[PDB]
Amino acid sequence: GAMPSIASMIKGNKVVVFSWVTCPYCVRAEKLLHARTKDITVHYVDKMSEGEQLRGEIYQAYKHETVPAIFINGNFIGGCSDLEALDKEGKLDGLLS
């Protein structure tokens, strides 16, 4: 909307992730991301006083609030399940270039 937030962070690395330290799905992603590349950044929005704004940027655009939220060259990936669904098909290896 009119007030800039997380949408700028997605341009500063090839892979960008938003996790919670307490979540298991966070770890399912963080494990596989370090297995497939070295070009990943992650933010822990449970450790962040503005984390409800960073969640609001995802919910106002995509009506979802479950973690991790995952991004690759500005394209959207709904979770570790949505990431692995491209790993299982050989298509994530074509995205990560």
Task: Specify the 3-state DSSP secondary structure of 60.
Answer: helix
Amino acid identity, position 81 = S
Separation between Cα atoms, residue 97 and residue 92, nearest integer Å? 9
Residues 6+ apart with CB under 8 A from 25: 66, 67, 68, 79, 80
User: Which residue reads 């996790």 in tokens?
Assistant: 19
> What is the number of structural domains in the chain?
1
> Cis link prior to 68 (omega < 30° from 0)?
yes
Distances (CA, A) of 10 to 6, 30, 74: 7, 17, 6
Method: NMR
What CATH number has the domain bearing residue 64? 3.40.30.10
Domain ranges, residue 8: 1-97
- Is residue 97 a contact partner of residue 46, using CB atoms and an 8 Å limit? no
